[PDB]
């Protein structure tokens, strides 16, 4: 489809290192898809918690299938639909 919509995913985890691997890992898998991903964008740590935001441009259905095939490692969280 024409698309033209961007998707943002927020990652949360006590250890920034772990969250860094999840964001970088997803970026490599997302970039592999026709859709493009920007970031990861680092955010302010709160309550000793690190969070990152990755923007997605022209997202495709192959990106969602890859996310379902890969399961985020324990200690990481994601926000969908606000």
């Amino acid at each position: 489809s024409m698309g033209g919509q961007k998707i943002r995913i927020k990652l949360k985890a006590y250890d920034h290192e772990l969250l860094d691997e999840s964001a970088k890992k997803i970026v490599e898998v997302a970039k592999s898809t026709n859709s493009k991903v920007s970031g990861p964008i680092p955010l302010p740590t709160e309550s000793r918690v690190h969070k990152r935001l990755i923007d997605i441009i022209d997202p495709s259905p192959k990106t969602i299938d890859a996310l379902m095939r890969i399961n985020l490692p324990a200690g990481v969280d994601v926000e969908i639909k606000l």
Side-chain angles (χ1 to χ4, degrees):
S1 97
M2 294 186 301
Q5 305 194 149
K6 295 185 186 155
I7 302 173
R8 297 184 188 66
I9 302 175
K10 286 179 191 219
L11 303 75
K12 304 189 179 234
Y14 297 98
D15 295 345
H16 72 284
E17 297 186 350
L18 281 57
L19 187 160
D20 293 359
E21 189 187 359
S22 190
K24 187 181 187 291
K25 188 181 186 257
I26 296 171
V27 173
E28 295 300 342
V29 185
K31 192 184 182 294
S32 305
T33 73
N34 192 1
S35 75
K36 297 184 186 81
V37 187
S38 191
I41 315 156
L43 253 79
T45 306
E46 298 184 352
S47 185
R48 298 184 188 73
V49 184
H50 301 285
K51 304 192 295 267
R52 292 189 184 262
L53 193 290
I54 304 177
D55 295 345
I56 302 177
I57 304 175
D58 243 339
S60 100
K62 295 184 184 205
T63 304
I64 301 173
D65 187 86
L67 185 51
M68 288 185 301
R69 295 182 68 149
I70 303 174
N71 190 55
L72 44 129
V76 185
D77 184 14
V78 302
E79 187 183 1
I80 187 69
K81 191 185 181 214
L82 303 187

